[PDB]
Design a protein around this ligand. Structure first.
Ligand SMILES: [Cl-]
Ligand SMILES: [Cl-]
Lengths: 156, 190, 149, 156, 149, 188, 188, 190
């Protein structure tokens, strides 16, 4: 009956699972709408390239950066794109403030089943990070390999 | 690849429409403790709650969307949320928008000359995804207003939103490709 | 019983109204000090900066939203406006976050009902944006009609 | 004996006056050192312009932006400039976190000499803002007037 | 009795050490996935991106410091690295701020004795940067002098 | 269209001036509970409070800007805030700045060669909006010295601020366009 | 200098491999209070604990990775963490990756035309550093399951991580330079 | 503007040096309640404390920089802070660096051909400002380790820091101008 320490994924504790699902859905929807309002009109197009850089991948990157309180190298310039960005910025402010209000307290909840934060309490944060690094490495390597094969197809 | 893109758009549109329709029609949205008689484990959807296991298994009863006595309607937010949840207007609107997008895709296939039909299909799919989001939020909020789980109809709706967004992106890409091809042909012919 | 917009509770309604008024005033003043002088225009001629009224509003919103944008004032008056707006944003946003942390600890996970309102706003904004885009598209398309006759 | 409400400048309450003075001095010193390490060497210079944009005014602007958690359109590129920037970033993180920990509680301290924040509690924030706007307007106007006079001297 | 570096109290020493290790690893991985492939180099040839090891370290530091930089990864692997580092930074910095508020609320103004350590670190960093700039200038001057002969 | 822009600027200037003038002179800034003789639902403006219901309905009493019964004086800063509120210096300054900007707009009609008059009008309107903001904050802060709501006189001032800022933007745009045309004629 | 860079890469690879090998095999990871028989100042590594003072000084006892006296089993995730700690899978993986990177360096030394061997060495060293990080976090988290300090084996592992990352950077730089030379030869 | 810049640099260097020297020498750094006998209002600097008002006005006593009994020489931070405060090494170092910068400016006046002297003066002034910052922080921290005010010597030191930083910026600007003029002359003559 010892007190149960928070899990590896205890950083998700401050928000309910439904909030996380709706955050993912809202992120996807905002990215899709931003890409749509930035790229659909032929009058935003000049081989031929767009007046803006907000493709679907770039829109997803911008939305992720906005939600992570980071920013990126691009920003919407049109009225509809800036409406999307501003409403997503307001959403991010509200959600991130609510999430980070009591994060440290959520990370050290001993349950029945002021002190410094310990590495264990954030160990799950590190694993994911390293996992991501590994994943990225794999992806990069795969691309290289693919291109190498293509180069062989070009060499024949 | 344009044919492959059109095939993916059609398959995704049909899959999203079918998943949303099944989610709305079926009643495996929430497993929770309650009574289906008109407290045991029951599965409930947008309209009906039915007991599973026990001795009254298989009996379904319509969900009471306006419960409690004295009908405290002094506020407006609670009544509006209850009415929106009872009508399920947003899941049904998402279904309708998915159907409209599929119809637009088919009509564009018949015509193959009016590019604005592709744009309309993409707008319909994106709006269907947004309606799905609003309906999910309304459903969860009304449930809040005692351990529960979400059934396969709920995740059918979630997957329908995901697929609808992907199909909307694909349709916008096809519209952009059509207009770029038109501009390139105009440049080449002049 | 908190409403759907209970995330606005940590600040009073007068604070929100005056925040909107201050945002408008700062954007207008930034645009004015950036664009009024003919000495900031080089040879329709082009300005030495990108701080028109629309871009000034965008910069002010980005500064208040802890996001930033792609432009930054370079003149003395523009940087005075930007710095004083930065100070205002730091104070106001820090106050909102501190008061929200106080409000939320009246550790139980936040429920979707406590934040659903913001989601509504988000979706509404998205819809509005799409509408605007479509309208703009139509205004060009019909224009092309009178450009093809 | 009525409770004394927080003053007009109660936003400075979370930090001692000595901390504010040392923050101003540290800001000045960091800006000066950044400008020095960015511009002193003739090998950073190409009429002739510098390889970087970190003049004293721009260094002050960058330092103010870093302290205000905002950022600007420039960032140091050299090793010496990036050391200044990183150490100032660490200083800003520590100081801003410490200052904003309990700001709202500091803004509502009734003194004998959870509630929403009222406009009065932040009125001093607004006045300064408007003051700044007015100041900036004045400055802009003065510049215009000055230039106009010069143009007259160029028109004779 | 808190020391001069009591601002590091909210996180354990192992957390700080692993933060340094993770920062180094993320910077190295970002540089590797950005620059290793010959297909990212165009015709000494130039890379399609600016994410060398030094710039990768600068980008990682800026991301962790809530400041940002002038560059952003554009490839898939680079953006995976950047996004996972953003997630790590959000969690870690939010945890530090929450635990620091808890530590400080054990309302009395903060005294300078509680932040003297960060002031000392700042001045030491400024001196180190000045020293580095002076050594670089002296080396370049000696190179110019020996070139002139 | 230069004529359309000038017409919009003039109409907005007149509307903002009228809204601030009505807001300053009317007594529907706030709804609260009080007494209009020497507790009941009542409406107050910048200068007077009038009972809204009860036996004393319709009787207006001048606002006690420096009460000496339940406050017995205050600090220097509180006295300064009370004096600024009592004088209504910032709403009146906003009215004056709106009027002067309107005169600047009208003055350029017979002074079409002088472009700095448009710039002066824009500056006057922007300053009028800033004075609006300061007056609003001062009024709300002084009211803080348990139910209340703001009436249409308060929101008349808010709308006046919005319209004044928009008219200032339009005037600055007109000034910029005038100097654009001047430099275009100088080029050719 | 290509030769200088290769020499530095080789020396760093050997140093990092030696540091991780020593850290894995030595018993000075942590200093704490415990018993080396069946409470006193003791030093522990990844496998055994040895008393430092008292009558039982110098006696080493294997670490009880799955104690059944003061713990009597636990949750599945806690058991998984204990299994990962007991196997020392990530420090050993870091050792293996450093060794394989060194072998890649040697293979490229006797295979000049094969450039991908440099890339393989860089990938191996970077992965060895990442495995070092994971092993460090796992070890510290498992130790959490009142004064302690880390000994020179722990910091040997930390230095091994740092040197492995630096050697990976150097190897990637060498690979980039080799492809630069190849494309320069192709252009000319 | 070069002559005006040099005149401003010299005047600011002399003013900063004089202000720092007066601040270090004089003892109006802090007004606080205490005892100058070896509790009344007293003024103290870096070395001495003297009573003001009362009947013992004018008597000065050296500050006890190592107070308290049992001589708890256990930690290191407290002893290091006490020693640094007692020596006043950083204010005196700032004075020395200001003097060195003034000497560099004067020497560069005689030569007018070695630009590195201007750079050395700028570095000296910037380092003097940094030393002033460190000394101020050390002094305040040691005071912390009962209402007090800061006297005119403290603000003399603060103004000395400000002026030293301004003069350092001016000196760096003069160095940059000299090198730019050298490069322009080299381009013109070749
Ligand atoms: Cl149902
Ligand atoms: Cl003294």
């Amino acid at each position: 009956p010892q007190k149960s320490k928070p899990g590896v994924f205890s950083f998700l504790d401050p928000l309910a699972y439904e909030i996380w699902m709706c955050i993912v859905f809202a992120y996807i929807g905002v990215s899709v709408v931003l890409f749509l309002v930035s790229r659909f009109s032929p009058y935003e197009w000049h081989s031929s390239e767009s007046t803006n850089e907000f493709g679907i991948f770039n829109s997803l990157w911008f939305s992720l950066g906005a939600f992570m309180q980071q920013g990126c190298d691009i920003s919407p310039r049109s009225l509809s794109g800036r409406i999307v960005g501003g409403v997503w910025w307001f959403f991010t402010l509200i959600i991130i403030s609510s999430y980070t209000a009591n994060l440290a307290a959520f990370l050290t909840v001993e349950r029945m089943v002021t002190s410094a934060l310990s590495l264990s309490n954030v160990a799950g944060v590190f694993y994911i990070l390293v996992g991501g690094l590994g994943l990225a490495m794999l992806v990069a390597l795969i691309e290289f390999c693919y291109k190498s094969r293509a180069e062989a197809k070009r060499m024949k | 690849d344009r044919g492959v893109q059109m095939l993916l758009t059609t398959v995704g549109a049909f899959a999203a429409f079918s998943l949303m329709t099944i989610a709305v029609g079926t009643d495996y949205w929430l497993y929770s403790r309650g009574v289906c008689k008109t407290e045991v484990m029951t599965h409930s959807g947008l309209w009906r709650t039915c007991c599973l296991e026990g001795n009254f298994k298989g009996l379904c009863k319509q969900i009471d969307h306006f419960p409690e006595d004295a009908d405290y309607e002094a506020d407006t937010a609670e009544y509006f949320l209850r009415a929106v949840r009872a009508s399920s207007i947003f899941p049904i609107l998402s279904v309708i928008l998915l159907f409209m997008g599929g119809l637009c895709i088919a009509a564009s296939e018949f015509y193959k000359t009016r590019h604005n039909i592709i744009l309309s299909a993409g707008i319909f799919f994106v709006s269907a995804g947004l309606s799905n989001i609003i309906g999910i939020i309304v459903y969860i909020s009304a449930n809040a207003g005692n351990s529960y789980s979400y059934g396969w109809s709920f995740y059918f709706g979630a997957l329908s939103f995901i697929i609808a967004e992907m199909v909307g992106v694909l349709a916008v890409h096809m519209f952009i490709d059509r207009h770029k091809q038109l501009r390139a042909t105009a440049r080449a012919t002049d």
